Q: What sequence folds into this?
């Protein structure tokens, strides 16, 4: 008679209660349609079991002494050229390797305790041709490589539901990046140089802002007369806004203060606050005027629909 | 004064009501942060408008005479090397082309009336390196190509929520295919030859069926004594089941009939129905016995959990 033992990788092994003619315990398990058999010094279900299919391909199940991992190998009829290998741990992490006709690594799937995973594809040269990475927060990264193993393309989805397409030049350097936010506003970077500089544009509902990219930050600029509004976006997506006016008259010169907590730029002329520009979480801009004391806001905040309207607010 | 005209691709053009000094109508539109201007013989908003950015890159908007399509071209400062081209029709279909630094096609996105689309990526050689196709029923196909423009990989999702991974050999012939159904049962084909033949396995809950693949069909086989059960799956997923017994005694010989409408194989021995094997929509097998007249089913249908149980039913 036998005991059934649960193993990592949703497998079972049957161990004899009594040892055999040689002092060993007899093992049986079923993989695919095939009964594997083996023997072990231990009676806990650990050991090696093997079988041979009708096509003479071979299956080997290796169960570690503490039942902490299983290895399942499938071989061609020569007994040494791998078809597949699956290593599964007690902690539910596993590596699955797939081999091509030659017995060389063709694809590899890795899953982890956290439920994250990686899929890798390999070419005729045994080099990594594509990789898809899923993390536990739902986010993912897909990478395509070229004959030199440099990036040709990359697509990233995030938890915030943004997506990014990245294209790379012949040398594997980022050349273009296209970010689509969940709300459908976009950032687009073109002509990106080896140092991470290039041209930038932010696509908002009803208008576009233009500017430049450095490795440090994105700077989008709006000029009207002598005033220059600059909207800065760090690599991490943190917005900060500034204003400079070359007007030297204390009567007409605009200055401003940025409040990071309220995402609000407050414009001042001649010692009095004149308006608040709010840079909202919906990726809109609203403008609202202060009263003649520069002390309280009047009327209601007005959502900007056009770049001319931003320019108007800077006059 | 001007009239505003709605165009394909969510654009607007302002046309003068009155013609100009040369008998032409003046056109204005805004693309990105840039005011484009032009003139036309017509007063409907059709014609060509152009602008030059602060970096001397150029934008050209071509609006057809019947307002049936727009073409928006972005050029480098030379005025001829494309950065991007977007052709948009009245029927909401559009082609978006992206060019690399050299002015060569790097990526192309096509969307259609039906809301289906294709994304294409091109390599340094101007050859198709990857393609993603989304159809209107939600289904999609992703293809990766090699340096010879033959397939290296393909991933397909369907409306029925099945997925398929396909791997290809050095010559671009299918070598492996792994089908995962929505219920988590699987078909796996290995060692696929140029004629579409190879090894097959169906992964069911609790057991695996093995067999072979031809271009015609998948045949999974279960043998017990002199009886052979064959489960056939066409390329389209249509199941049919047959049984043959080499037993020559009319007293013990099994035969069977397949009912495609009820997905049921009915076994007969000695002129009496003995059991129904149902091949269910959940990709399970149930067995149920007939009474001693072979006329009505007795007890209840029992879900098979193991290959040994199928073999038992064939004894």
A:
């Amino acid at each position: 008679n036998s005991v059934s033992v649960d193993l990592p990788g949703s497998m079972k092994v049957l161990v004899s209660k009594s040892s055999n003619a040689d002092g060993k315990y007899d093992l049986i398990a079923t993989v695919d349609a095939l009964e594997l058999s083996g023997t072990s010094d231990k009676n806990n279900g650990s050991g090696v079991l093997e079988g041979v299919k009708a096509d003479a391909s071979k299956v080997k199940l290796t169960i570690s002494d503490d039942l902490g991992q299983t290895t399942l190998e499938v071989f061609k009829s020569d007994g040494s050229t791998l078809v597949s290998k699956k290593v599964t741990s007690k902690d539910k992490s596993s590596t699955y390797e797939l081999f091509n006709e030659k017995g060389e690594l063709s694809a590899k799937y890795i899953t982890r305790a956290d439920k994250s995973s990686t899929y890798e594809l390999f070419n005729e040269k045994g080099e990594l041709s594509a990789k898809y990475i899923t993390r536990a927060d739902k986010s993912s990264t897909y990478e395509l490589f070229n004959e030199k193993g440099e990036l040709s393309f990359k697509y990233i989805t995030r938890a915030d539901k943004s997506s990014t397409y990245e294209l790379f030049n012949e040398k594997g350097e980022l050349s273009f990046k296209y970010i689509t936010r969940a709300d459908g506003t976009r950032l687009e970077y073109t002509g990106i140089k080896s140092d991470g500089s290039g041209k930038a544009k932010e696509v908002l509902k009803g208008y576009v802002l233009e500017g430049t990219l450095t490795a440090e930050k994105t700077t989008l600029v709006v000029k009207e007369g002598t005033v220059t509004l600059s909207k800065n976006i760090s690599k991490s997506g943190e917005v900060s806004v500034e204003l400079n006016d070359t007007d030297s008259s204390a009567a007409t010169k605009k200055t401003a203060a940025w409040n990071s907590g309220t995402s609000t730029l407050t414009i001042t002329v001649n010692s009095k606050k004149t308006k608040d520009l709010v840079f909202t979480s919906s990726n809109t801009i609203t403008v609202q005027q202060y009263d003649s004391n520069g002390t309280s806001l009047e009327g209601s905040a007005v959502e900007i629909t056009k770049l001319d309207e931003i320019k108007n607010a800077l006059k």
Q: What stands out?
A: Residues 1-315 of chain B form one domain.
